[PDB]
């Protein structure tokens, strides 16, 4: 005739004034916690009731594409920006300010800027290789009276 939730208690722990508002989530996870989480997942583990649940699980696992379809989904070119791809003149600072070498590297940088198939790293690598090659060939260039740096 009495509610079970109301009555004499253990009276060991008083009603906590404030719950834990300063969690220790910064701690590293333990194998015990990993297995506890695995069991928490297992208690919900059930066979798929219908095809919609299968699609939901596949989307969660990443096996199935998200919709609406984004052809660039799951791909960012290292978070680059348009100015990094196009304005590559800043990478020509190791080249003569004026001269035939500057003209050729201007052509090369224009071609690279027009190129949408190369990441910024590869575009920079091309210019770096050109710089290294010209440095190794500075003798011939200076014979032709064209200074390189």
């Amino acid at each position: 005739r009495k509610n079970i939730f109301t009555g004499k208690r253990l009276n060991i722990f008083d009603m906590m004034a404030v719950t834990k508002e300063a969690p220790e989530t910064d701690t590293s996870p333990s194998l015990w916690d990993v297995e506890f989480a695995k069991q928490l997942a297992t208690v919900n583990e059930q066979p798929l009731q219908n095809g919609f649940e299968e699609l939901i699980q596949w989307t969660k696992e990443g096996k199935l594409w998200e919709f609406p379809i984004n052809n660039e989904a799951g791909f960012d070119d290292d978070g680059s920006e348009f100015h990094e791809h196009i304005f590559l003149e800043k990478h020509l600072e190791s080249f003569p300010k004026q001269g035939p070498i500057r003209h050729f590297m201007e052509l090369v940088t224009c071609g690279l800027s027009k190129n949408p198939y190369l990441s910024v790293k590869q575009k920079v690598e091309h210019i770096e290789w050109f710089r290294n090659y010209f440095n190794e060939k500075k003798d011939i260039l200076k014979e032709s009276n064209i200074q390189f740096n």
Binding site: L107, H126, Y133, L141, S144, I146
Partner: protein, 101 residues
């Protein structure tokens, strides 16, 4: 386990061309221009000649991907005419039907 030794040679050529494509492009860009001095262009010619022969893209042949046939290959499907006909006449290629008009 390729179809024939010719297919193996083509695979090796494709792999080497992919490996050396960046350097070949850089050296060709150094060559195919008039801005740079002639001596540097001649040096670039010698350097690109010194590259391995199989790295040249012109040596790549579009053999069939299933019978190594070097001719009659449809580039869109990379199959010889005989294999393509065999698959299309059995209905195993989507949307391909006999053309009658």
């Amino acid at each position: 386990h390729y179809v024939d030794w010719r297919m193996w040679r083509d695979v090796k050529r494709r792999k080497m061309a992919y490996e050396y494509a960046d350097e070949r492009l850089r050296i060709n860009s150094l060559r195919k221009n008039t801005i740079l001095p002639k001596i540097l262009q001649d040096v670039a010619d010698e350097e690109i000649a010194a590259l391995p022969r199989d790295s040249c893209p012109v040596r790549i042949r579009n053999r069939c991907v299933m019978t190594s046939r070097p001719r009659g290959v449809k580039r869109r499907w990379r199959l010889s005419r005989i294999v393509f006909r065999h698959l299309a006449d059995h209905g195993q290629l989507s949307g391909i039907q006999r053309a009658t008009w």
